[PDB]
Design a protein around this ligand. Structure first.
Ligand code: HEM
Ligand SMILES: Cn1ccc(-c2cccc(COc3cc(N)nc4nn[nH]c34)c2)n1
Ligand SMILES: CC(=O)N[C@@H]1[C@@H](O)[C@H](O)[C@@H](CO)O[C@H]1O
Ligand SMILES: CC(=O)N[C@@H]1[C@@H](O)[C@H](O)[C@@H](CO)O[C@H]1O
Ligand SMILES: CC(=O)N[C@@H]1[C@@H](O)[C@H](O)[C@@H](CO)O[C@H]1O
Ligand SMILES: CC(=O)N[C@@H]1[C@@H](O)[C@H](O)[C@@H](CO)O[C@H]1O
Ligand SMILES: CC(=O)N[C@@H]1[C@@H](O)[C@H](O)[C@@H](CO)O[C@H]1O
Ligand SMILES: CC(=O)N[C@@H]1[C@@H](O)[C@H](O)[C@@H](CO)O[C@H]1O
Ligand SMILES: CC(=O)N[C@@H]1[C@@H](O)[C@H](O)[C@@H](CO)O[C@H]1O
Ligand SMILES: OC[C@H]1O[C@@H](O)[C@@H](O)[C@@H](O)[C@@H]1O
Ligand SMILES: OC[C@H]1O[C@H](O)[C@@H](O)[C@@H](O)[C@@H]1O
Ligand SMILES: OC[C@H]1O[C@H](O)[C@@H](O)[C@@H](O)[C@@H]1O
Ligand SMILES: C[C@@H]1O[C@@H](O)[C@@H](O)[C@H](O)[C@@H]1O
Ligand SMILES: [Ca+2]
Ligand SMILES: [Cl-]
Lengths: 465, 103
């Protein structure tokens, strides 16, 4: 009924009950709020309950543009034929753009700070404001669209308002694919899985289902293990920008005021490039900022993100650990000794075996993040399979994939491969010292940092008409 | 479906011409394995107090978090070979792929 304030288990509620002797919640009657995922078929007793993906499975930069036609329009700058994306008409970041504001009833951002009265932003994805580090990436991508639209307008002034948006959109999505598969994924999988689940692209395949797998939604939440308990803000000399250079994550969630009124995107990106990610260790999985203080500023109680992930997988009726190991063709541990061997940690095998009883019952994210990491990769073999399998499908099953014949020319493809996210930072911010390739590896200043001039820009000459 | 098309649609519709809602928005997730529920079709494991899963009791996610995910934050091992930007792109990319809507 009302999952937000009620601990009664009436649909669509599925509240997370508190165990005896909890480190934080001493009230046993109380519980963690939970709204069950929407059924693709509400009320049916014939279909096995499934869930909806409100987004385009494609690596098309739908978090920029929108996955629904009304929101695609109410995001574009309709006042001119320069085909840009609309921006914040009330605030700026040293003259540079800021994502527009969203009209919301139950606005979570306003509850982070009453005095500032800064609401949520407006991007092609409702989750743009969840954290300033995510608002930063979002603000960078919108800026890079208007930046491309302009650079194309002066190249072809004989192009209208629609053509400009579409041609910069095309390039944007392509830059998302380029940074995903060339830069991100190898550093997620490692070289082994990268050759197994993602061999050299041949050509588009219409027989490859490009949907997101119900499992991928819980499995790709491996990133929760890479979460730093503070938002790291850094000055133009990569030093702790005071006040608040290490702001606790429980005070950054939804706090949109921190972007607008506390430095803008520039100190956030610098701190993103220069701070190390958290390392997933068998005894140190995810931080208590997200485990005890999740959305603490906006809710009647702070949630436990790793627990949500587990209940969510049950809500999505996901088969446990052993079902997926098999799906992947990996051995299936049946006992603590066997699991001990699988995890290469008998202490963890025993702790999990105590909770679950058998590894068959181990919740997919729980078992996936418990597995030891691959060579040069940030996941174990189960998540490498689930993640890899999905990305193979999103690449070969994408008719507008950058490498596919017809999407871009032989020429544009040559131009596009020169792109990188540091280069995107150079042109859309007042940041001059940038992460030397690979941006996702590089975490120490100035040891792994270079200047903006030492990077080649995207030549849009092949784009001329 | 149009015979000739220069760009992507906003909803993902028409990317596959044979099954035009494949990868498109506001459509059901593909399942790589059959779903697993208490009743076999709707009720999640954990739902009914008593009901066990594969012969074993259902472990509370909060308890699994408390006992397997919890550690002291001061002990945090920082990654040498990875930047916080690595964590940040994953979220941005995930938000290009999936959003399971709630009520
Ligand atoms: C900013 C830090 C993050 C926070 C606070 C966060 C928070 C959340 C929350 C609250 C949910 C929904 C939980 C539920 O109720 O079932 C979620 C889902 C998700 N998160 Fe995270 N997340 C973060 C980072 C990431 C990272 C780094 C990744 C992966 C690289 C990621 C991947 C996912 C995925 C796949 C989902 C499910 C998306 C859907 O289809 O609705 N998250 N996250
Ligand atoms: C229309 N509307 C309904 C709900 C929302 C909304 C907007 C911002 C944050 C959140 C909660 O936070 C997340 C949820 C999720 N499903 N996946 C995530 N990944 N990171 N944070 C996530 C929900 N908008
Ligand atoms: C919503 C939006 O972008 N409105 C703008 C306005 O702010 C600006 O002065 C001009 C720049 O091209 O175009 C129009
Ligand atoms: C308009 C306003 O209140 N501005 C404030 C000021 O009070 C103070 O220097 C600081 C910390 O409290 O945050 C900012
Ligand atoms: C509790 C809190 O977040 N306070 C800050 C404050 O220091 C400053 O006065 C203000 C600007 O309006 O932003 C808010
Ligand atoms: C959707 C589809 O065509 N799937 C088929 C698959 O079942 C077969 O194993 C394989 C080898 O030829 O090619 C693929
Ligand atoms: C020529 C080519 O690439 N054919 C493959 C085929 O084996 C498979 O059925 C399908 C998905 O596996 O994709 C197609
Ligand atoms: C649903 C399931 O378990 N499928 C797996 C399959 O993907 C794999 O090739 C093989 C190895 O275990 O057997 C079957
Ligand atoms: C991070 C980086 O490369 N900073 C450089 C420095 O090393 C170099 O001495 C100077 C001129 O070449 O410009 C600045
Ligand atoms: O796709 C899931 C996996 O299932 C198992 C084998 O069939 C592999 O060929 C594949 O890697
Ligand atoms: O090993 C599981 C399976 O994965 C996939 C293909 O690469 C197969 O050749 C392989 O044997
Ligand atoms: O079910 C989808 C996926 O997982 C299984 C395997 O047989 C794969 O080759 C396939 O692409
Ligand atoms: C994307 C391709 O489609 C299916 C499989 O037969 C291939 O291994 C690959 O996963
Ligand atoms: Ca998409
Ligand atoms: Cl506005």
């Amino acid at each position: 009924v009302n999952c937000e304030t009620s601990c009664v288990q009436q649909p669509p509620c599925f509240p997370l009950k508190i165990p005896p002797n909890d480190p934080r919640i001493k009230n046993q009657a109380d519980c963690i709020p939970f709204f069950r995922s929407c059924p693709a078929c509400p009320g049916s007793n014939i279909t096995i309950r499934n869930q909806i993906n409100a987004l385009t499975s494609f690596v098309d930069a739908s978090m920029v543009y929108g996955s629904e036609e009304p929101l695609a329009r109410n995001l574009r700058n309709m006042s001119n034929q320069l085909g840009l994306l609309a921006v914040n008409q009330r605030f700026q970041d040293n003259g540079r753009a800021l994502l527009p504001f969203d009209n919301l009833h139950d606005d979570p951002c306003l509850l982070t700070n009453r005095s500032a009265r800064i609401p949520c932003f407006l991007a092609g994805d409702t989750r743009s404001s969840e954290m300033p580090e995510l608002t930063s990436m979002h603000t960078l991508l919108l800026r890079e669209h208007n930046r491309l639209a302009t650079e194309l307008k002066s190249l072809n002034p004989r192009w209208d308002g629609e053509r400009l948006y579409q041609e910069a959109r095309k390039i944007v999505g392509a830059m998302v694919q380029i940074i995903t598969y060339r830069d991100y994924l190898p550093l997620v999988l490692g070289p082994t899985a990268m050759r197994k689940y993602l061999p050299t692209y041949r050509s588009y395949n219409d027989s490859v289902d490009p949907r997101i797998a119900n499992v991928f939604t819980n499995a790709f939440r491996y990133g929760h293990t890479l979460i730093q308990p503070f938002m790291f803000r850094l000055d133009n000399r990569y030093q702790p920008m005071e006040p608040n250079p290490r702001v606790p994550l429980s005070r950054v969630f939804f706090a949109s005021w921190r972007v607008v009124l506390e430095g803008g995107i520039d100190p956030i990106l610098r701190g993103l490039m220069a701070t190390p990610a958290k390392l997933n260790r068998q005894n140190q999985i995810a931080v208590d900022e997200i485990r005890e203080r999740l959305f603490e500023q906006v809710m009647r109680i702070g949630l436990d993100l790793p627990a949500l992930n587990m209940q969510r997988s049950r809500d999505h009726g996901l088969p446990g650990y052993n079902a997926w190991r098999r799906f992947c063709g990996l051995p299936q541990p049946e006992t603590v000794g066997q699991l001990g061997t699988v995890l290469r940690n008998l202490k963890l095998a025993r702790k999990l075996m105590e909770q679950y009883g058998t590894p068959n019952n181990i919740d997919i994210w729980m078992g996936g993040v418990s597995e030891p990491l691959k060579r040069k990769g940030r996941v174990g073999p189960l998540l490498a399979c689930i993640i890899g399998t999905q990305f193979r499908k999103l690449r070969d099953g994408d008719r507008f994939w950058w490498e596919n014949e017809g999407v871009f020319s032989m020429q544009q493809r040559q131009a596009l491969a020169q792109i990188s996210l540091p280069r995107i930072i150079c042109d859309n911010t007042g940041i001059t010292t940038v992460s030397k390739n690979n941006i996702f590896m590089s975490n120490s200043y100035p040891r792994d940092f270079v200047n903006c001039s030492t990077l080649p820009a995207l030549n849009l000459a092949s784009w001329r008409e | 479906c149009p015979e000739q098309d220069k760009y992507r649609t906003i909803t993902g519709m028409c990317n596959n011409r044979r099954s035009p809602t494949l990868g498109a928005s506001n459509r059901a997730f593909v399942r790589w394995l059959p779903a697993e529920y208490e009743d076999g079709f709707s009720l999640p494991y954990g739902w009914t107090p008593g009901v066990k899963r594969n012969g074993f009791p259902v472990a509370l996610a909060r308890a699994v978090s408390n006992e397997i995910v919890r550690f002291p934050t001061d002990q945090l091992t920082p990654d040498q070979e990875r930047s916080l930007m690595f964590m940040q792109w994953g979220q941005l990319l995930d938000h290009d792929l999936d959003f399971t809507p709630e009520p």
